Design a binder for this molecule. Structure first.
Ligand SMILES: NCc1ccc(C(F)(F)F)cc1
Ligand SMILES: NCc1ccc(C(F)(F)F)cc1
Length: 330
């Protein structure tokens, strides 16, 4: 079987992408943030503290004839940005773009951090990293992808994120009309539970390509591109007036500047991020200082190929017994 769903940016800056997901019987449709950097499927629900819900669509397990409480199970997650949530666990039927899994663990939020409350357009997350990172206790639970794997025509999913436009998540098949050229595959390490891979280098604008190994994770759940300080300094040095701002928390640039492109290597192939993808607009309303889409990973401890990089490519998440990541231009 296969599944295919449209994913849509939540605002004009592509800060995140939401994809509709059917949960329960009869279906309750929630718009979830597909996150290859985490492994919990959690949702705003009728159990969430009422003061922490502000416009989100909630899952109501008591209205689903297929929902079953998972006795004694709980979950608690903290994300790298300091966001967090926690609650109890149901099992229920979950469908994505026609692809149905029965008995999927649906983690019902009882408490969420303020960053989720203030994001009225995100009803939850659907984790797509490896199941070893799932936070359900005492019995760890599998991801949607892991549960669907056996029934998929091919054990893959693909991410085709749009620049200021809708895109597609496909499960079980590779749409050969969605990319140009060939797909270049590269090795994945699962030792940390992430889709972790090694980029072969980078170039700034039309500059010389620098061959250097950059270990990082492919993370649809993170907005920006987080790279080592040396790389990021070389990028912003080519932008007149760009500087690192401690008060703002990263590199900013005069909004009137034109940004150079950024190229990263995948084996012998090259993915080019257009300069316009790196513009994240004024730091505050009316400001002539703009926030950069490439920032240092020095404070994070890991390099992150977030949406800024992934939306420049067609990305194959190959969940075969030896997993690999595939990148193609589009
Ligand atoms: N999108 C989930 C996520 C959040 C944080 C991290 C970090 F910062 F720990 F690498 C990775 C993945
Ligand atoms: N990396 C996971 C993640 C996804 C979304 C959010 C936000 F923006 F909704 F708070 C936080 C963390």
């Amino acid at each position: 079987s296969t599944g295919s769903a449209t994913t849509t940016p939540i605002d004009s800056l592509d800060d995140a992408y939401i994809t509709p997901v059917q949960i329960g019987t009869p279906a309750q449709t929630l718009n979830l943030d597909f996150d290859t950097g985490s492994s919990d499927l959690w949702v705003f629900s009728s159990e969430t503290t009422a003061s922490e819900v502000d416009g989100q669509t909630i899952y109501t397990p008591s209205k689903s004839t297929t929902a079953k409480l998972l006795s004694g199970a709980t979950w608690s997650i903290s994300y790298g940005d300091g966001s967090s949530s926690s609650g109890d666990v149901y099992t229920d039927t979950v469908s994505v773009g026609g692809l149905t899994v029965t008995g999927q663990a649906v983690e019902s939020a009882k408490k969420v951090s303020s960053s989720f409350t203030e994001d009225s357009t995100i009803d939850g997350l659907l984790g797509l990293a490896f199941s070893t990172l799932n936070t359900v206790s005492p019995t760890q639970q599998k991801t949607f992808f892991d549960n669907a794997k056996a029934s998929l025509d091919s054990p893959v999913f693909t991410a085709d994120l749009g620049y200021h436009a809708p895109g597609t998540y496909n499960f079980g098949f590779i749409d050969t009309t969605a990319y140009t050229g060939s797909i270049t595959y590269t090795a994945v390490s699962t030792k940390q539970g992430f889709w972790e891979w090694t980029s072969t280098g980078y170039a700034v604008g039309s500059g010389t390509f620098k061959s250097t190994s950059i270990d990082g994770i492919a993370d649809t759940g993170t907005t920006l591109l987080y790279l080592p300080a040396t790389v990021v300094s070389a990028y912003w040095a080519q932008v007149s007036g760009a500087k690192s701002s401690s008060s703002v928390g990263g590199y900013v640039f005069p909004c009137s500047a034109t940004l150079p492109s950024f190229t990263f290597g995948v084996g012998s192939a090259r993915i080019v991020i257009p300069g316009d993808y790196i513009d994240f607009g004024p730091i505050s309303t009316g400001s002539s200082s703009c926030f950069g889409g490439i920032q240092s990973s020095a404070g994070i401890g890991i390099n992150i190929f977030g949406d800024v990089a992934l939306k420049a490519a067609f990305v194959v998440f190959n969940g075969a017994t030896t997993p690999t990541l595939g990148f193609a231009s589009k």
